[PDB]
């Protein structure tokens, strides 16, 4: 298990997201779905010149998996995935412009325009786990409960083939994001035009 410190600006952004009074928390789902869509675009693009890239999985989709027992909402995609280098690297410039925008009068819902939309996960989650598998690397698990650090480790769990899984360990008062009707309403409102199938799993 490797422990890393977040770069100062990211730690600051994460503190801002956790501490600011902001009721419109549902925006986290649109940000994660949009990141999944971008990774799916990357694998679809790379597969045109090289079809062997789809050997780790042909289907390009997004699955939303609520688990009331574990209090987790999982966003799974069969996108390009991330290598260990991509995982650790993937923000400093966007983070800076976003803080400045907020002070100027902008709101947390514009987070995606600065390429740091992922951190909106901390509006609803006390801990985020990211499992990823890229064709050029092994399966890795990234994890952070904020507090200025994150861990990275080789994942020993079930192989994914290719893609990224975001496991949101929800805060006690945010269990509405495990409800079928609530998830449906959010996806309809903010992610109506994603160019990939979004399957909401039922329990």
Q: Contact residues for ligand C4K (CB under 6 A)?
A: 32, 35-36, 38-39, 77, 79-82, 87, 90, 118, 130, 132, 142, 164, 166
- Least distance from ligand C4K to the Cβ atom of residue 23, Å: 23
Residue closer to ligand C4K, measured from CB, 32 or 123: 32
> Shortest CA distance to 146 belongs to which of 167, 166, 119?
119
**Closest approach of ligand C4K to the CB of residue 77, in Å:** 5
Residue closer to ligand C4K, measured from CB, 104 or 196: 196
- Whole-angstrom distance, CA of residue 162 vs CA of residue 54: 9
- Is residue 77 annotated as involved in ligand binding? yes
Distance CA 52, CA 39 (A): 17
Output the smallest distance, CB 126 to ligand C4K, in A. Answer: 16
Q: How far is the CB of 105 from ligand C4K (least distance, A)?
A: 25
Closest separation in Å from C-beta 94 to ligand C4K? 10
* Residue whose CB is less far from ligand C4K, 20 or 90: 90
6 appears as a binding residue in the annotation: no
89 is in an annotated binding site: no
Comparing CB distances to ligand C4K, the nearer of 166 and 181 is: 166
Q: Is 174 left (phi over 0), alpha (psi -120 to 50) or beta?
A: alpha
Residue number with CB closer to ligand C4K (87 or 178)? 87
63 labelled ligand-binding:
no
| Token pair belonging to 60 | 């390009």
Which residues belong to the annotated binding site for ATP? 35, 77, 92, 118
């Amino acid at each position: 298990v490797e422990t890393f410190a977040f770069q100062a600006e990211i730690a600051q952004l994460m503190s801002l997201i956790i501490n600011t009074f902001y009721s419109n928390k549902e925006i986290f789902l649109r940000e994660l779905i949009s990141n999944s869509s971008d990774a799916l675009d990357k694998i679809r693009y790379e597969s045109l010149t090289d079809p062997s890239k789809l050997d780790s999985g042909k289907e390009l989709h997004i699955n939303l998996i609520p688990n009331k027992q574990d209090r987790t909402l999982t966003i799974v995609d069969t996108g390009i995935g991330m290598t260990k280098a991509d995982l650790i690297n993937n923000a400093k410039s966007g983070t800076k412009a976003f803080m400045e925008a907020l002070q100027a009068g902008a709101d947390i819902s514009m987070i995606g325009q600065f390429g740091v939309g992922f951190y909106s996960a901390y509006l609803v989650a006390e801990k985020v786990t990211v499992i990823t598998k890229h064709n050029d690397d092994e399966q890795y698990a990234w994890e952070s409960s904020a507090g200025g650090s994150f861990t990275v480790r080789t994942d020993t769990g079930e192989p994914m083939g290719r893609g990224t899984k975001v496991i949101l360990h929800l805060k006690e008062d945010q269990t509405e994001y495990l409800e079928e009707r609530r998830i449906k309403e959010i996806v309809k409102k903010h992610s109506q035009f994603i160019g990939y199938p979004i399957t909401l799993f039922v329990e």
